[PDB]
Design a protein around this ligand. Structure first.
Ligand SMILES: CC(C)CCCC(C)CCCC(C)C[C@@H](O)P(=O)(O)O
Ligand SMILES: [Zn+2]
Lengths: 401, 4, 312
């Protein structure tokens, strides 16, 4: 394993003897991770990376039905819980009962607002985060019924209701503004085919203002480059077919710098710590950046791998981010939840599967049963559900008015 | 991680 | 009026001033999914919220209730919205509300609604007088709270409060020179006040940054900052650069020195230079060292820079 090797130990943190609050914390994670790495040596077994797929399935399968009061804090993020669970199962190649999928469809219909979009639960004001989630859920199911839950004529009204003169959108009426709104609107509007000519007017320009001196993208122009916002920005530009509104060179140097030499997983910001959900937000940026670069006819691009260590990210996840009882997590010690479950898995799948036209170099770490279904690097739903949804809505006219 |  | 934590807290259903209203329960549908088993207390406040809201009862009791609804789930943006409506309608003392949101943010500094609610009040009041001091207190508990820095940039930008922020950035950079939020803030500030076009400023910056590098050579932020402030004019328009950095090869080396050199070389090539053939050889060797020995986590990127360095 790239990680359990002896030279990899030189990838340990160089403190410079000038220790700050950052060195300290980083060095702490590194030790807890080292332990996991050396887990094998101390115990005298041969290393066998395996994805506790059954344990994970039973966790997800239960949460799709009911959660403890520990989830009272995500009571305004219910379409998210459907998405995270229904996508983890989707990647684990697990089943979505013709009855459960309906209930999900029926529940989301209750979340949907008469003004368009979706709320965090029955009766909540529509918000772009839950709308993005509800739409991705409905597409993962992908049936006349699910698709039919989405009110496209109302969704455009709503999208237009949030649209800002400078190109940005609010997340909800009277709500905040940051790149998530741009990606959320772009993802749902494109999939459901409601993109008019002036919908995203000036949106690519605002998103390009979020790109700062680091090569990365921040929440709003002027802010620190962050991995979850950089994915929202890049993916939003890929949808709008405007990746080129950014300096892709520096964006590439920035994203690639985010992978932890010693841990293998990614960090959300320069000098922060690794975190499993970033296995998708950050690593997902390379496939996006492959297309982008090859699109401008780049020669130096690989025909088998992404521009990050696919091996190291799969070791990090398999070894360090898996919960014995099921579910994945931030890093060792951290508790499990459906968000990290949905994102460590999405990142594993990004890491295991490459593409480049007709090239297909999958890399599956450990037990080959560890390979996951594929996921689309823009929507983060199976590439088939994406294709299936867009075309179905494509036979509907954009809500012209 | 709070995303909303 | 009555704490959710008080030993003598009573359910809204058991309340005398809340009997004329019927608690509207959540409708998750005959066959629930991702259904949360709320506590009797969580369900109680919310059944009453659904009703007051549903009635659009813009009352003082409704006001006091959102407070409890917010404490049970501060991330409930719908309740936060109805509360702003009550703020306007009931014509509430906003400064008193500034104090409320101040305490709530201290509690959940990573909540999106609380920061936005605060921003709405400051706008209503057109008063940014408490901001930099409040933020600095939050950044004192977590020097990298994204919401705190973002809110900070808004107060400075909008109210044009730039004068003492670089002094603040310097303070925090003294506390943790690896604080990327501060390196970014320093750029935000300089680039919005004087800019980096001023030779004296540019020099002062590169000097200071070359210092932080020749002090904590493996601190990436200082490297991405120095690169950031120069790369926007051409690293190759700075002859002395390659030298001073080359001087740090054995005294302050990290794969950052090598990566920066690979970046200068790239620009001495874009701009064409004598010895370019050797330059390209030196640069590709560095790409192989970083790719094979010096920084293999990104061997895919480093060899790709080797291959692009071929074509262009
Ligand atoms: C809603 C989306 C489509 C994407 C959200 C992506 C994110 C994980 C965003 C994270 C928001 C912020 C600023 C988090 C910070 O508090 P931190 O970097 O500490 O986690
Ligand atoms: Zn995370």
């Amino acid at each position: 394993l790239y990680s359990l090797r002896p030279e990899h130990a030189r990838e340990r943190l160089q403190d410079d003897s000038v220790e700050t609050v950052t060195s300290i914390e980083q060095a702490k994670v590194e030790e807890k991770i080292q332990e996991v790495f050396s887990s094998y040596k101390f115990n005298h077994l041969v290393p066998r990376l395996v994805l506790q797929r059954e344990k994970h399935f039973h966790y997800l399968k239960r949460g799709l039905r009911q959660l403890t009061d520990a989830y009272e804090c995500l009571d305004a993020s219910r379409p998210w819980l459907c998405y995270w669970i229904l996508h983890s199962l989707e990647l684990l190649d697990e089943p979505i009962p013709q009855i459960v999928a309906t209930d999900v469809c029926q529940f989301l219909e209750l979340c949907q607002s008469p003004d368009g979009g979706f709320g965090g639960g029955p009766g909540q004001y529509p918000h772009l985060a839950p709308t993005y989630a509800a739409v991705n859920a409905l597409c993962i199911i992908g049936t006349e019924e699910a698709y039919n839950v989405i009110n496209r004529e109302k969704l455009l009204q709503y999208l237009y209701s949030l649209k800002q003169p400078d190109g940005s959108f609010l997340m909800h009426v009277g709500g905040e503004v940051d790149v998530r709104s741009a990606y959320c609107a772009a993802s749902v509007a494109s999939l459901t085919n409601i993109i008019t000519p002036d919908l995203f007017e000036g949106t690519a320009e605002w998103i390009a203002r979020c790109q700062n001196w680091e090569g990365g993208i921040g929440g709003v122009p002027g802010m620190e480059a962050h991995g979850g916002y950089t994915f929202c920005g890049l993916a939003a530009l890929v949808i709008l077919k405007k990746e080129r509104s950014l300096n892709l060179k520096s964006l590439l140097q920035w994203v690639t710098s985010r992978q932890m030499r010693f841990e293998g997983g990614f960090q959300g910001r320069c000098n922060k710590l690794v975190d499993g959900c970033y296995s998708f937000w950050q690593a997902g940026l390379l496939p996006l950046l492959h297309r982008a670069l090859h699109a401008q006819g780049d020669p130096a691009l690989s025909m088998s791998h992404w521009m990050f260590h696919q091996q190291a990210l799969q070791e990090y996840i398999l070894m360090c981010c898996q919960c014995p009882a099921g579910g994945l997590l931030d890093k060792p010690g951290k508790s499990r939840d459906f968000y990290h479950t949905c994102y460590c898995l999405s990142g594993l799948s990004i890491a295991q599967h490459f593409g480049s036209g007709a090239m297909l170099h999958d890399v599956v770490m450990g037990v080959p049963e560890n390979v996951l279904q594929p996921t689309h690097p823009v929507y983060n739903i199976g590439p088939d559900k994406v294709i299936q949804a867009t075309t179905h809505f494509l036979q509907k006219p954009v809500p012209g008015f | 991680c709070v995303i909303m | 009026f009555l704490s959710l934590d008080s030993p003598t807290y009573v359910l809204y259903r058991d309340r005398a001033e809340w009997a004329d209203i019927d608690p509207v329960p959540q409708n998750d549908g005959p066959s629930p999914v991702v259904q949360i088993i709320y506590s009797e207390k969580f369900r109680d406040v919310y059944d009453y919220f659904r009703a007051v809201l549903q009635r659009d009862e813009r009352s003082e009791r409704a006001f006091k209730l959102t407070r409890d609804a917010i404490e049970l789930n501060a991330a409930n943006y719908t309740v936060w919205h109805f509360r702003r409506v009550l703020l306007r309608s009931l014509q509430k003392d906003l400064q008193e509300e500034m104090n409320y949101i101040t305490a709530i943010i201290e509690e959940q500094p990573k909540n999106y609604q609380v920061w936005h609610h605060r921003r709405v009040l400051v706008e209503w009041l057109k008063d940014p007088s408490q901001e930099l001091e409040f933020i600095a207190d939050i950044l004192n508990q977590d020097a990298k709270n994204y919401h705190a820095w973002q809110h900070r940039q808004w107060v400075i930008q909008e109210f044009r409060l730039w004068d003492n922020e670089l002094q603040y950035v310097d303070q925090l950079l003294k506390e943790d020179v690896r604080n990327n939020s501060v390196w970014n803030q320093r750029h935000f500030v300089i680039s919005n006040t004087t800019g980096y076009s001023d030779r004296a400023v540019l020099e002062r910056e590169v000097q200071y940054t070359l210092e932080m590098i020749k002090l904590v050579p493996h601190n990436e932020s200082a490297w991405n900052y120095l690169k950031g402030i120069l790369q926007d004019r051409g690293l190759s328009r700075y002859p002395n650069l390659l030298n001073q950095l080359l001087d740090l090869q054995p005294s302050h080396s990290s794969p950052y020195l090598i990566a920066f050199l690979v970046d200068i070389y790239e620009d001495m090539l874009e701009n064409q230079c004598d010895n370019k053939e050797d330059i390209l050889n030196k640069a590709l060797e560095l790409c192989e060292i970083l790719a094979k020995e010096k920084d293999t986590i990104r061997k895919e990127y480093w060899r790709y820079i080797g291959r692009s360095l071929q074509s262009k």
